[PDB]
Amino acid sequence: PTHFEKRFLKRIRDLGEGHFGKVELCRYDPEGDNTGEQVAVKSLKHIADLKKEIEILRNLYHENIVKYKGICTENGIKLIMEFLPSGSLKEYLPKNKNKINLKQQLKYAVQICKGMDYLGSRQYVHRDLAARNVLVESEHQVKIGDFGLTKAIETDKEYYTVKDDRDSPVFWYAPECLMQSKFYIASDVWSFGVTLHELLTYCDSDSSPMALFLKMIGPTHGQMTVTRLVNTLKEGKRLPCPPNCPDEVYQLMRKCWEFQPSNRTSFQNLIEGFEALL
C-alpha cells in the first residue's frame, strides 16, 4: 500500500515545477491494464528536506490534509500522495471567479481552519500557509498540501526557532517570524489571514500579498525587503479589505493580524466565526 515501485509510476503530466524539484501526475499501474489509480508524485532536481516533509505528512491523517499514499525509493526518495485534480486555490480561483460565491469562500475558510487546527493539535507549525498550498478536492472541499517548511513545536514550548538558510514566504509571515525567527501556532493564524485575503481576491496576481506589500514599501534592495516589511507592519499597515468582502469577514481577517501573537484569534474561534455567517 505505502511502497510504490518506480517502474509502475507512469508519468502523465506536470502539476507543479520549482527550481529544486517538481510535482507530477502519475498512474501507479502494476497490472499494466491502465486501471491503476492516479497519484501526485513529489520529487527533486533539499534531499534531507523532502524526507522531513515525508516524515511529517506520513504522521498526519485528516479530512482537510492532503492524503499521504507512500514513498518511492531509488538514496533519492519520492513522495506519493492523493491527486486533487482541481489543483491549488491559486490555480482554481482565477479560472472559477464567476462560479465561486461568498458562501463557497466561507466553506473553504472553515475547511482550511479545520485542517490547521488538526495540525496545531499535532504540535506542528505549517510555515507556508498560502493559497498555492491549499488544494481543491471539489466545489465544496479543500485540503492543506505542502509540509516542506513545517516544524514541530517542542512539548510545553510556545514556538519553534528557525535556524536555517532556506527561502521563506515573507509576505505571508507574522512579525515575530521576520524579526526573531519564532514560529507559534498564532504565526500560522497570521498566514491564514493572508490566505483568506487571497481567497477573497480570487488569487488575482495584481492583488497578491507580495504585489500589494511591495507597492506599500516602495523601491527596495532584496537584502532590505524584510526590514522594510517589518517597519510597514509596525506602523499598523495591513492588506486592505477586498472589495465585496463583508465587514464581518474582514474583522475576522483583522483578528489574524494583531501584531503580538497572543492577541490573535484561534483557529477554533475562526471556525465558529465563519460558521455563524453560513
Ligand SMILES: Nc1ncnc2c1ncn2[C@@H]1O[C@H](COP(=O)(O)OP(=O)(O)O)[C@@H](O)[C@H]1O
Ligand atoms: N496532491 C496534489 N494533487 C494535485 N496537485 C498538486 C498536489 N500537490 C501539489 N500539487 C500542485 O503542485 C504545486 C506544487 O506543490 P507543493 O507540494 O505545494 O510544492 P513546493 O514545495 O514545490 O512549492 C501546487 O501548487 C499544486 O499546484
Ligand SMILES: [Mg+2]
Ligand atoms: Mg507549494
